[PDB]
Amino acid sequence: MGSSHHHHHHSSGLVPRGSHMVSLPEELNRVRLSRHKLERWCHMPFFAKTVTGCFVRIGIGNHNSKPVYRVAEITGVVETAKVYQLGGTRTNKGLQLRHGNDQRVFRLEFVSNQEFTESEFMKWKEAMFSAGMQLPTLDEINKKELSIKEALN
């Protein structure tokens, strides 16, 4: 039909249909994960795969003067040597978020629950651009948003 079996022969290639690239924070908002979602998936099984590729709204700089939030791509879940206090879950893990090429671990607690903006998107865009990394395609976004609904439901 559409998603029927696993079509995985992608070492490199040209994706059809969602062949264009995400240039809207809105599409990044459907694949956007908030800490609330992470919180509820915190106790769940291997969600790390599902969240990998999806984007989270992390705030870096949000503490001093202006609420600075940026788009960060989730690159897996790593463990921390110290469990933190979050909406009541207790977890010693984090995701490896990435802004362009900024691969860094952030705790669920630093994550936003608000929506993305053009300012945030463009800032991530400049990070990816400055990294030489390409923006994701709408196919990926589709696969992520679909994976999201399968994770929650």
Q: What is the dihedral of CA 88, 93, 99, 103, to 10 degrees?
A: 170
Give dist(CA 86, CA 45) in Å, integer: 18
Cβ neighbors of 24 (< 8 A, separation 6 or more) are: 121
Taking the CB of residue 114, how many other CB atoms lie within 10 A of it? 13
Taking the CB of residue 27, how many other CB atoms lie within 10 A of it? 22
Closest by CA to 70, choosing from 126, 30, 145, is 126
Domain 20-153 has CATH 3.90.70.200: yes
Closest by CA to 55, choosing from 140, 132, 131, is 140
Elucidated via: NMR
Using the CB atoms, write b or e for 63-87: b if 16+ within 10 Å: eeeeeebbbbbbbebeeeeeeeebe
